[PDB]
């Protein structure tokens, strides 16, 4: 696989339900769904090392990791966490997150390159899975 690319979102599902689990109130949920509908993801993959840039209209974040090596990022609702990415197949990876402080829902994300050329990202909190689908710009 090669995840490298400038990816633009075409579909965004269940993001409000995810934010509901994470405690966000209704109006901020609606505004965040609108922001998530503009998500863009830039990936540079060098073997098992990933440089990712995730952005919306007013915000951008850089996430750099190596498969199998712990790193620090933040959960979807913004709490710092320790993360660990593993492959689950040739074209899909899964990240488990553990909070640095306090407690919360169990959170994770996945990234998958499909045979049709799409990038599928999911974000999970407990039983609620959000699915974002992207195509190359
Ligand atoms: C490989 C892809 C990764 C690690 C994607 C991470 C995405 C996020 C942490 C999502 C952030 C968003 C919000 C919290 C609300 C506004 C829009 C998003 C989708 C950028």
Residue 17 is given by DSSP the state: H
CA of 60 to the centre of ligand 1 (A): 9
Beta strand pairing call for 119-125 and 80-87: unpaired
Ligand 1 probe mutation, 14, 76, 77, 111, most atoms within 8 A of CB: 76
Method: X-ray
Domain that holds residue 7: 1-137
Distances (CA, A) of 125 to 34, 42, 44, 117: 20, 24, 26, 27
Distance CA 19, CA 26 (A): 9
For residue 118, give the CATH number of its domain.
2.40.128.20
Domain count, the chain: 1
Q: Resolution to 1 decimal, in Å?
A: 1.7
Q: Which residues of 45-70 are buried (b: 16+ CB within 10 A; e: fewer)?
A: eeeeebebebebeeeeeebebeeeee
List the one residue out of 5, 2, 82, 6 whose CA is nearest residue 48: 2
């Amino acid at each position: 696989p090669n995840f490298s690319g400038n990816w633009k979102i075409i579909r965004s599902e269940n993001f409000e339900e995810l934010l509901k689990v994470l405690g966000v109130n209704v109006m901020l949920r609606k505004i965040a769904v609108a922001a998530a509908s503009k998500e863009a993801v830039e990936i540079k993959q060098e073997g098992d090392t990933f440089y990712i840039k995730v952005s919306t209209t007013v915000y951008t974040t850089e996430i750099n990791f190596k498969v199998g090596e712990e790193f620090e990022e933040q959960t979807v609702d913004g709490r710092p966490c320790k993360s660990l990415v593993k492959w689950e197949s040739e074209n899909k990876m899964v990240c488990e997150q553990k909070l640095l402080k306090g407690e919360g829902p169990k959170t994770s994300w996945t990234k998958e390159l499909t045979n049709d050329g799409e990038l599928i990202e999911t974000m999970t909190a407990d039983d609620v899975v959000c699915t974002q689908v992207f195509v190359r710009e």
